[PDB]
Amino acid sequence: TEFFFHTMAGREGLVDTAVKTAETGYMQRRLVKSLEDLCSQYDLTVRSSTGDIIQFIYGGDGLDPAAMEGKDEPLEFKRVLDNIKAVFPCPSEPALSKNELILTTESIMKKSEFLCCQDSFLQEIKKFIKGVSEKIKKTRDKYGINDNGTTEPRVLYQLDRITPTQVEKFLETCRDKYMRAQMEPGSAVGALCAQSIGE
Amino acid sequence: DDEEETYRLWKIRKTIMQLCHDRGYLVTQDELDQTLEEFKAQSGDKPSEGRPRRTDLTVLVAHNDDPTDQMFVFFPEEPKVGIKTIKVYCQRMQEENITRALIVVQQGMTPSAKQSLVDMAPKYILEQFLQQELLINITEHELVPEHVVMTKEEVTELLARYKLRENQLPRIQAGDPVARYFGIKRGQVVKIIRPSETAGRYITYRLVQ
Amino acid sequence: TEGRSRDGGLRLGEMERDCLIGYGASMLLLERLMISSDAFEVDVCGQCG
Amino acid sequence: KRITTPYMTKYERARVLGTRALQIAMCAPVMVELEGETDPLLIAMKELKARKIPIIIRRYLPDGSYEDWGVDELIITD
Amino acid sequence: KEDLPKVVVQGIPEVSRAVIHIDEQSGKEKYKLLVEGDNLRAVMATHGVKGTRTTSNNTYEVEKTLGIEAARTTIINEIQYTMVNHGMSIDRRHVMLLSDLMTYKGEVLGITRFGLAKMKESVLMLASFEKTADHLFDAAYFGQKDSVC
Ligand SMILES: [Zn+2]
């Protein structure tokens, strides 16, 4: 009895495999047969073969999904900061307070090359660095860590140790990654979208 | 009786007057902050006063730029508006020399009257609606962004930027609710302000047909 | 020709002409589909068409 | 002033390498020195790394305007 | 006598059923109303309902009642919601593109033989897809030129 019931369920599961793929095939063909033409241009609009605009900016941001390290997002700043910390553990540089952090970053971000960046990204990194500044404040407060650099248990400074060279490296690498996540003009967005919806 | 009906009349006044305000024509905040009870104080009662002209408005002059442009607001009490009523309100509009007239009907329009409402007078516009549509203002809904009508200079700037010809834009059609909401004549462009998962507002432009 | 029984080589259905576009390659598609397979030359008259 | 991106895209890399390989396959002049190489495409990638290729890409905008960029002058990366 | 009992007396003629769904999460242990029916305009014709926060799953309904922009957002929303409802991931840019394509013409044009005719113009790709002979003969009738584009 159980054997027969179990086989009745097994064949039931079996029979759907090919039919689902038939319906998948007549999704695939009719989609790509309509959407394959769309191309992304050097001005960053998306235009039909007749040249008429469809999207003024592709994807609202001009960024290829193939670059997103985060959830549809190009970066995870926690990970990046940890990585940069590990590779360059310079012991000579001093530690910085919230004031030093903010003045150092402001000293750098004002550079024009950053101003060539999407303002939104700059504001977001501002928020990230502001949050870490607040946390380092919390830590030094909870351990009353002297900014003068004079306390005996030197270990106390290792808690949230960061250095200006590290700030420079982190910011420049963030710029690099963001810049290289852009979609390249000439790519066939329509075909990739079609296959992404189909598979 | 028909407490809901009185509430509906209150709400149609509220919403129509908010619409006309948004369209730039003469409205004042003290009017905007009217209350249902205050409206009760103004009006009579559903059985005592009825559907006819009791609290409707025609003060809606083009306070925005030139009050000489003005709208009527008419409340034909008959469930179905016939061509003869169209003539009655046509001579109302002509006598008053008013350029616009917002019409609301209870249960719709006759074919002759429906036909006339596209050819009555090129000089005049008599936008038609039913009370049901006006019970809510579509602008308040979550599922729609804000919009703006763009002046020819701004249109020129945009089409210069990307070097387009207006026919190359995305389209919007005259029959869309928002299009009627603002009475946008075809051959124009409106800016769309799309919200986003982030503060970055998505801005985009669309041509009316 | 058709296949192994009669010396036909391979078939490259629509669903690979799709992936070639996916990558975006153009000279590969042009070659694979008209140069190598069955290229031919014809003559037309401009005046009448 | 030029507006297009200063980096070279995948597609430009592909086509420039392809066409220069076609050229080099024939007896066209060559500039980078060769260590017993025999394949055209390897000569092509050597030169591209050396930025020796005699080509200018003429990018086209949709409206008929255009820019020019020197292959020796774009930003290149692996 | 057999006909009269069927007649409507009260309620929405077009509504089939509704239900008060109830929730329990800490944020709020409250109630919410779910409806089946194909007149979104009708329900917002009522007092009590927070009509500004309504929604109809049907694309045509939202298009009819709120306009094309709401229809577009609903298309993207529904594709993504159904996909995650199963458990798939798909980058939102793809689905955003596909959303806009359907509506750039000022109307929702589905991916159908009818939509395709209303969306493309060249001849061969019509003739390749479906209704070939019809398209061919009508094209010869019109004397259409066709660019290789
Ligand atoms: Zn001839």
From Swiss-Prot, chain A:
Localization annotation: Nucleus; Cytoplasm, Cytosol
Specify the signal sequence span: none
Span-the-membrane segments of this chain are: none
State the superkingdom: Eukaryota
What is the tissue specificity?
Expressed in the brain, in the cortex and the white matter (at protein level).
Region Bridging helix, as annotated, extends over: 1-40
The family assignment reads: Belongs to the RNA polymerase beta' chain family.
What is the purpose of this protein?
A: Catalytic core component of RNA polymerase III (Pol III), a DNA-dependent RNA polymerase which synthesizes small non-coding RNAs using the four ribonucleoside triphosphates as substrates. Synthesizes 5S rRNA, snRNAs, tRNAs and miRNAs from at least 500 distinct genomic loci. Pol III-mediated transcription cycle proceeds through transcription initiation, transcription elongation and transcription termination stages. During transcription initiation, Pol III is recruited to DNA promoters type I, II or III with the help of general transcription factors and other specific initiation factors.
Name of the protein in its database record:
DNA-directed RNA polymerase III subunit RPC1
Q: Which organism is it from?
A: Homo sapiens (Human)
Gene name per UniProt? POLR3A
Swiss-Prot record, chain B:
Biological process per Gene Ontology, one example term: transcription by RNA polymerase II
Q: Which Gene3D superfamilies match?
A: RNA polymerase, Rpb5, N-terminal domain (3.40.1340.10), RPB5-like RNA polymerase subunit (3.90.940.20)
**Domain of life of the organism in this record?**
Eukaryota
Care to name a GO molecular-function term for this sequence? DNA-directed RNA polymerase activity
Q: Keywords assigned by UniProt? A: Acetylation, DNA-directed RNA polymerase, Host-virus interaction, Isopeptide bond, Nucleus, Transcription, Ubl conjugation
- What does UniProt give as the signal peptide span? none
Query: InterPro entries from the entry?
Result: Arch_Rpo5/euc_Rpb5, RNA_pol_Rpb5_N, RNA_pol_Rpb5_N_sf, RNA_pol_subH/Rpb5_C, RNA_pol_subH/Rpb5_CS, RPB5-like_sf
GO CC terms of this entry: cytosol; nucleoplasm; nucleus; RNA polymerase I complex; RNA polymerase II, core complex; RNA polymerase III complex; RPAP3/R2TP/prefoldin-like complex
Q: Identify the PANTHER family for this entry.
A: DNA-DIRECTED RNA POLYMERASES I, II, AND III SUBUNIT RPABC1 (PTHR10535:SF0)
According to its UniProt record, which protein family does this protein belong to? Belongs to the archaeal Rpo5/eukaryotic RPB5 RNA polymerase subunit family.
The entry's function note states: DNA-dependent RNA polymerase catalyzes the transcription of DNA into RNA using the four ribonucleoside triphosphates as substrates. Common component of RNA polymerases I, II and III which synthesize ribosomal RNA precursors, mRNA precursors and many functional non-coding RNAs, and small RNAs, such as 5S rRNA and tRNAs, respectively. Pol II is the central component of the basal RNA polymerase II transcription machinery. Pols are composed of mobile elements that move relative to each other.
Organism of origin is Homo sapiens
Curated annotation (Swiss-Prot), chain C:
Q: What is the effect of changing R11H?
A: In CMT1I; affects RNA polymerase III assembly; no effect on nuclear localization
Q: Which residues bind DNA template strand?
A: R4, S5, R11
Q: Which residues bind Zn(2+)?
A: C45, C48
The entry's localization annotation reads: Nucleus; Cytoplasm, Cytosol
Q: Which family does it belong to?
A: Belongs to the RNA polymerase beta chain family.
Give the quaternary structure: Component of the RNA polymerase III (Pol III) complex consisting of 17 subunits: a ten-subunit catalytic core composed of POLR3A/RPC1, POLR3B/RPC2, POLR1C/RPAC1, POLR1D/RPAC2, POLR3K/RPC10, POLR2E/RPABC1, POLR2F/RPABC2, POLR2H/RPABC3, POLR2K/RPABC4 and POLR2L/RPABC5; a mobile stalk composed of two subunits POLR3H/RPC8 and CRCP/RPC9, protruding from the core and functioning primarily in transcription initiation; and additional subunits homologous to general transcription factors of the RNA polymerase II machinery, POLR3C/RPC3-POLR3F/RPC6-POLR3G/RPC7 heterotrimer required for transcription initiation and POLR3D/RPC4-POLR3E/RPC5 heterodimer involved in both transcription initiation and termination.
Q: What is this protein called?
A: DNA-directed RNA polymerase III subunit RPC2
Gene source species: Homo sapiens
Native organism taxonomy: Eukaryota, Metazoa, Chordata, Craniata, Vertebrata
- The encoding gene is POLR3B
| Section of the entire sequence shown | 1036 to 1084 of 1133
UniProtKB/Swiss-Prot annotation, chain D:
- Biological processes, Gene Ontology terms: transcription by RNA polymerase I; transcription by RNA polymerase II; tRNA transcription by RNA polymerase III
What are the UniProt keywords, alphabetically?
A: Acetylation, DNA-directed RNA polymerase, Nucleus, Phosphoprotein, Transcription
- Give the GO cellular component terms, alphabetically: cytosol; fibrillar center; nucleoplasm; nucleus; RNA polymerase I complex; RNA polymerase II, core complex; RNA polymerase III complex
Annotated Gene Ontology MF terms?
DNA binding; DNA-directed RNA polymerase activity
Main localization is nucleus
Could you name the domain of life of the organism this protein comes from?
Eukaryota
Localization per Swiss-Prot or TrEMBL: Nucleus; Nucleus, Nucleolus
Described purpose of this protein according to its UniProt entry: DNA-dependent RNA polymerase catalyzes the transcription of DNA into RNA using the four ribonucleoside triphosphates as substrates. Common component of RNA polymerases I, II, and III which synthesize ribosomal RNA precursors, mRNA precursors and many functional non-coding RNAs, and small RNAs, such as 5S rRNA and tRNAs, respectively. Pol II is the central component of the basal RNA polymerase II transcription machinery. Pols are composed of mobile elements that move relative to each other.
Entry similarity comment: Belongs to the archaeal Rpo6/eukaryotic RPB6 RNA polymerase subunit family.
Name of the molecule in the record: DNA-directed RNA polymerases I, II, and III subunit RPABC2
Q: Which organism is it from?
A: Homo sapiens
Residue window of the full protein shown: 50 to 127 of 127
